[PDB]
A paper describes a structure:
However, homologs of the latter, also termed the CULT domain, are further found in animals and bacteria as single-domain proteins, that have all essential residues of the thalidomide binding site conserved. Architecturally, the thalidomide binding domain is a member of the β-tent fold, which consists of two antiparallel beta sheets that are oriented at an approximately right angle and pinned together at the top via a structural zinc ion.
As we have so far not been able to crystallize MsCI4 in the absence of ligands, we tried the following prolonged soaking experiment: We soaked crystals of the original orthorhombic crystal form of MsCI4•thalidomide for many hours in the cryo-protectant solution in order to “wash out” thalidomide from the binding sites. Diffraction experiments were performed with crystals from two different crystallization conditions after 40 h of washing. In the two resulting structures, thalidomide was retained in two of the three monomers in the ASU, but released in the third monomer. In one of the structures, “Wash II”, three regions totaling to 37% of the previously structured part of the main chain were no longer traceable in the electron density. The largest is the most N-terminal unfolded region, which starts between β2 and β3 and comprises the hairpin formed by β3 and β4, leaving only a C-terminal remainder of β4. The second region starts in the middle of β5, comprises the first tryptophan of the aromatic cage, and ends at the cage’s second tryptophan at the start of β6, rendering its indole side chain disordered. Therein we find a minimal invariant consensus structure that exactly coincides with the structured part of the “Wash II” structure: While the three flexible regions derived from the washing experiment are found in a multitude of conformations, the remainder of the protein is essentially invariant in all structures.
Residue numbers in the entry: 18 to 124
Amino acid sequence: GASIFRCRQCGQTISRRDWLLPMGGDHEHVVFNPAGMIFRVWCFSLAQGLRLIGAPSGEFSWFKGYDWTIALCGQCGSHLGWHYEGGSQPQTFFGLIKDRLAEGPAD
Ligand SMILES: O=C1CC[C@H](N2C(=O)c3ccccc3C2=O)C(=O)N1
Ligand SMILES: [Zn+2]
């Protein structure tokens, strides 16, 4: 019942529990943006069904050495999180907003 993560707003398949990545020791990171919004961000090595938009940027990055791009649900356009790139071990990963995903079984 806990294996697949889907978009909460439309059901698009996004990631899997098996693809969780413990960045800095924890797959979960609680962070704030410049607009004062708090997010519980889950780190994943891999995700699918997103649409990555905009130019990568280092500004305000919560993960040192990475640049981010906005990750939208590719089906509904809900903002699900960010794609990180340009770093090391790993080079890239996804930080997705936990409350914007629904977790459940494969069937
Ligand atoms: O690592 C990240 C991802 C992007 C995220 N972020 C936002 O959520 C945001 C909203 C408004 C203006 C600027 C930002 C920005 O850098 C942020 O603050 N850090
Ligand atoms: Zn969606």
